C-alpha cells in the first residue's frame, strides 16, 4: 500500500506538498506516480500524471516530484477552490496491480465563519393523515463543520426519536446538515417544536406550531 | 464525447452475486486499457480490476476469486461479475479509461453496490409546504441511492438534495428543498420526482 | 528491429502486440535470440508485461502501433 497524510491544512497564496511514501515494491522500483482531486459528491479527476507531467485543463501552479522511494504534489499560490480529497497512485508489484493512496484532506486556513442557515418543516397534512409525523431541519451553508442539534417540546429537550446526520462539505467549501423528528400525531398536537442548533458557540433557533 | 455509464447497482444479499455493466462511447474498449475502482462511503479509492487492449486480466487480492471482468468489443460495453459479496464490498463502483501508465483519465458517474440481510423498501414521499423554502421528504427507503428532480428536471439551480439519514431502524430518509421567491408562489408549479430504482418506485409530488 | 522481434515470435505474445516490446526496447530460471526467449518466460509470470518497469510508465496505455 502507498501511505499519505490523513491531512494539510495550508494557507492562501501560500504553497503546499502532500506526500505519497511508497515501498521497494511500488516507487522504490521506479513506478510513475499519478495524483487525483476529488471535489465532494463528485468522481476523482487526473492532476498529474507520471511524476511531473499535466493532462490539458490543469492549471500551471499544480507540480509534481519524484524522490527515490516516495513522491509529492505541490500547490503555489493556495486558492480555496482547492479544497478536496487528494489521492497517490502507482503501481504495486508484490500485488501485480495499481494501488492507491489513502487520501489527503487538503485544508484552506484564512476562511471567514459563516453562521448556518437554518429552516424547520413541521409533518405535512398528508403524512398525518397515515398516522405517522415526521419534523424536518435542514441546516446548510456553516464554516466550520461542526454543529449540535437539540429539540424542544414546549421548553422541555426532546431525544427520542431525534436522528442527526454527519456534517457534510457543500461545493462552496461550506457545510450541510439535518434532524428528524419522529413524533406520533398526537405529541404534534399535545404541545410549539423547536430545532436549536449550535455553531462555534452560536445558537440559531427554529420554531413549528398550522 | 468520451461518455462511461454504468449500471447494475443495487442490493445484494450476503454470499450472493451481482453484474455490473458500463456502457461505453466516443471511443472503442477493445483498443483500450479498462478497469473498475470503488469507493465505500467516506473512504478512500481501491483499484479492483483491469483488463488489457490485448485481453490480460488483473485484479486486487481482496477480489481474486470472486470477482471477474470482462468486455463486450461488438456492443463495447465493459463489465464486472462480483460473487460470494460481503458488507466489505459496499461502495460506489467507478468504470475507468486507462491513459499513459494506468493513470486514469475518464470515470463514469458510478454506482452504488450495497451488501446487507435487510430487503428493499420503498420510500413514502410527502410535501414540505413553503425567499421562501419548500421540499419533498422521501421518508423510509433502503437501500441508496434516491433520484430527486424539480418540474421534470426544468428547475435545477437552487436544488439542494440534502444527504440522507441512517436511522436505527437501518432505513434511510432524505429530503429535498428548493428556495424560491416568496411571494410569486401564485404563478408557478411546483413537483418533485422521486426515483428508487430497487423498488422500482417513481411518485411525482405536487409542493403547495 | 520491427523485422527482428517479429521474426522471433513477439508480435501479440500473451496479448502482447508487437509496438508493445518495440517501445520497451527503446525505454537461473531463464537458464543462460536468448534475450527474446527469457522475456516471454519473465512475461508469463503474475506481473506481465508490467516486468520492465519502464513499459508500464512509458508504453501501458499509448499509441503503441506507432513503433511499427
Same mark, same amino acid.
Request: hydrophobic residues 35%; contains cysteine.
Given at each position: 500500500?502507498?501511505?499519505?497524510?490523513?491531512?494539510?491544512?495550508?494557507?492562501?497564496?501560500?504553497?503546499?506538498?502532500?506526500?505519497?511514501?511508497? !515501498?521497494?515494491?511500488?516507487?522504490?522500483?521506479?513506478?510513475?506516480?499519478?495524483?487525483?482531486?476529488?471535489?465532494?459528491?463528485?468522481?476523482?479527476?487526473?492532476?498529474?500524471?507520471?511524476?511531473?507531467? !499535466?493532462? /490539458?485543463?490543469?492549471?500551471?501552479?499544480?507540480?509534481? =516530484?519524484?524522490?527515490?522511494? =516516495?513522491? $509529492?504534489?505541490?500547490?503555489?499560490?493556495?486558492?480555496?477552490?482547492?479544497?478536496?480529497?487528494?489521492?497517490?497512485?502507482?503501481?504495486?508489484?508484490?500485488?501485480?496491480? $495499481?494501488?492507491?493512496?489513502?487520501?489527503?484532506?487538503?485544508?484552506?486556513?484564512?476562511?471567514?465563519?459563516?453562521?448556518? $442557515?437554518?429552516?424547520? #418543516?413541521?409533518?405535512?397534512?398528508?403524512?398525518?393523515?397515515?398516522?405517522?409525523?415526521?419534523?424536518?431541519?435542514?441546516?446548510?451553508? #456553516?464554516?466550520?463543520?461542526?454543529?449540535?442539534?437539540?429539540?424542544?417540546?414546549?421548553?422541555?429537550?426532546?431525544?427520542?426519536?431525534?436522528?442527526?446526520?454527519?456534517?457534510?462539505?457543500?461545493?462552496?467549501?461550506?457545510?450541510?446538515?439535518?434532524?428528524?423528528?419522529?413524533?406520533?400525531?398526537?405529541?404534534?398536537?399535545?404541545?410549539?417544536?423547536?430545532?436549536?442548533?449550535?455553531?462555534?458557540?452560536?445558537?440559531?433557533?427554529?420554531?413549528?406550531?398550522? | 464525447?468520451?461518455?462511461?455509464?454504468? =449500471?447494475?447497482?443495487?442490493?445484494?444479499?450476503?454470499? &450472493?452475486?451481482?453484474?455490473?455493466?458500463?456502457?461505453? /462511447? &466516443?471511443?472503442?474498449?477493445?483498443?483500450?486499457?479498462?478497469?473498475?475502482?470503488?469507493?465505500?462511503?467516506?473512504? &478512500?479509492?481501491?483499484?479492483?480490476?483491469?483488463?488489457?487492449?490485448?485481453? /490480460?486480466?488483473?485484479?486486487?487480492?481482496?477480489?481474486?476469486?470472486?470477482?471477474?471482468? $470482462?468486455?463486450?468489443?461488438?456492443?463495447?460495453?465493459?463489465?464486472?461479475?462480483?460473487?460470494?459479496? !460481503?458488507?466489505?464490498?459496499?461502495?460506489?463502483?467507478?468504470?475507468?479509461?486507462?491513459?499513459?501508465?494506468?493513470?486514469?483519465?475518464?470515470?463514469?458517474?458510478?454506482?452504488?453496490?450495497?451488501?446487507?440481510?435487510?430487503?428493499?423498501?420503498?420510500?413514502?414521499? #410527502?410535501?414540505?409546504?413553503?425567499?421562501?423554502?419548500?421540499?419533498?421528504?422521501?421518508?423510509?427507503?433502503?437501500?441508496?441511492?434516491?433520484?430527486?428532480?424539480?418540474?421534470?428536471?426544468?428547475?435545477?439551480?437552487?436544488?439542494?438534495? #440534502?444527504?440522507?439519514?441512517?436511522?436505527?431502524?437501518?432505513?434511510?430518509?432524505?429530503?429535498?428543498?428548493?428556495?424560491?421567491?416568496?411571494?410569486?408562489?401564485?404563478?408557478?408549479?411546483?413537483?418533485?420526482?422521486?426515483?428508487?430504482?430497487?423498488?422500482?418506485?417513481?411518485?411525482?409530488?405536487?409542493?403547495? | 528491429?520491427?523485422?527482428?522481434?517479429?521474426?522471433? &515470435?513477439?508480435?501479440?505474445?500473451?496479448?502482447?502486440?508487437?509496438?508493445?516490446?518495440?517501445?520497451?526496447?527503446?525505454?537461473?530460471?531463464?537458464?543462460?535470440?536468448?534475450?527474446?526467449?527469457?522475456?516471454?518466460?519473465?512475461?508469463?509470470?503474475?506481473?506481465?508485461?508490467?516486468?520492465?518497469?519502464?513499459?508500464?510508465?512509458?508504453?501501458?496505455?499509448?499509441?503503441?502501433?506507432?513503433?511499427?
Amino acid at each position: 500500500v502507498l501511505t499519505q497524510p490523513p491531512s494539510v491544512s495550508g494557507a492562501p497564496g501560500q504553497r503546499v506538498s502532500i506526500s505519497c511514501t511508497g !515501498r521497494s515494491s511500488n516507487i522504490g522500483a521506479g513506478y510513475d506516480v499519478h495524483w487525483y482531486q476529488q471535489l465532494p459528491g463528485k468522481a476523482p479527476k487526473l492532476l498529474i500524471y507520471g511524476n511531473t507531467n !499535466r493532462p /490539458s485543463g490543469v492549471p500551471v501552479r499544480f507540480s509534481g =516530484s519524484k524522490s527515490g522511494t =516516495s513522491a $509529492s504534489l505541490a500547490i503555489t499560490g493556495l486558492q480555496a477552490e482547492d479544497e478536496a480529497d487528494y489521492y497517490c497512485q502507482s503501481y504495486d508489484s508484490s500485488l501485480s496491480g $495499481s494501488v492507491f493512496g489513502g487520501g489527503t484532506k487538503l485544508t484552506v486556513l484564512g476562511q471567514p465563519k459563516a453562521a448556518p $442557515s437554518v429552516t424547520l #418543516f413541521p409533518p405535512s397534512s398528508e403524512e398525518l393523515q397515515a398516522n405517522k409525523a415526521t419534523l424536518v431541519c435542514l441546516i446548510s451553508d #456553516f464554516y466550520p463543520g461542526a454543529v449540535t442539534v437539540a429539540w424542544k417540546a414546549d421548553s422541555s429537550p426532546v431525544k427520542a426519536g431525534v436522528e442527526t446526520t454527519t456534517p457534510s462539505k457543500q461545493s462552496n467549501n461550506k457545510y450541510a446538515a439535518s434532524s428528524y423528528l419522529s413524533l406520533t400525531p398526537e405529541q404534534w398536537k399535545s404541545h410549539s417544536y423547536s430545532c436549536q442548533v449550535t455553531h462555534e458557540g452560536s445558537t440559531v433557533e427554529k420554531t413549528v406550531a398550522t | 464525447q468520451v461518455q462511461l455509464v454504468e =449500471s447494475g447497482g443495487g442490493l445484494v444479499q450476503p454470499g &450472493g452475486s451481482l453484474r455490473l455493466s458500463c456502457a461505453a /462511447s &466516443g471511443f472503442t474498449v477493445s483498443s483500450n486499457y479498462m478497469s473498475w475502482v470503488r469507493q465505500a462511503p467516506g473512504k &478512500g479509492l481501491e483499484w479492483v480490476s483491469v483488463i488489457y487492449s490485448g485481453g /490480460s486480466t488483473y485484479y486486487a487480492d481482496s477480489v481474486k476469486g470472486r470477482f471477474t471482468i $470482462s468486455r463486450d468489443n461488438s456492443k463495447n460495453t465493459l463489465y464486472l461479475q462480483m460473487n460470494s459479496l !460481503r458488507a466489505e464490498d459496499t461502495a460506489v463502483y467507478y468504470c475507468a479509461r486507462e491513459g499513459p501508465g494506468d493513470s486514469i483519465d475518464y470515470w463514469g458517474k458510478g454506482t452504488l453496490v450495497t451488501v446487507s440481510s435487510a430487503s428493499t423498501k420503498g420510500p413514502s414521499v #410527502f410535501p414540505l409546504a413553503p425567499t421562501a423554502a419548500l421540499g419533498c421528504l422521501v421518508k423510509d427507503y433502503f437501500p441508496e441511492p434516491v433520484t430527486v428532480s424539480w418540474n421534470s428536471g426544468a428547475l435545477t439551480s437552487g436544488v439542494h438534495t #440534502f444527504p440522507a439519514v441512517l436511522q436505527s431502524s437501518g432505513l434511510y430518509s432524505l429530503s429535498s428543498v428548493v428556495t424560491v421567491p416568496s411571494s410569486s408562489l401564485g404563478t408557478q408549479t411546483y413537483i418533485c420526482n422521486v426515483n428508487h430504482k430497487p423498488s422500482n418506485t417513481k411518485v411525482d409530488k405536487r409542493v403547495e | 528491429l520491427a523485422a527482428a522481434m517479429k521474426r522471433h &515470435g513477439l508480435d501479440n505474445y500473451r496479448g502482447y502486440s508487437l509496438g508493445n516490446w518495440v517501445c520497451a526496447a527503446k525505454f537461473n530460471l531463464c537458464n543462460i535470440t536468448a534475450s527474446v526467449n527469457c522475456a516471454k518466460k519473465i512475461v508469463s509470470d503474475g506481473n506481465g508485461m508490467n516486468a520492465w518497469v519502464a513499459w508500464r510508465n512509458r508504453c501501458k496505455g499509448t499509441d503503441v502501433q506507432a513503433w511499427i
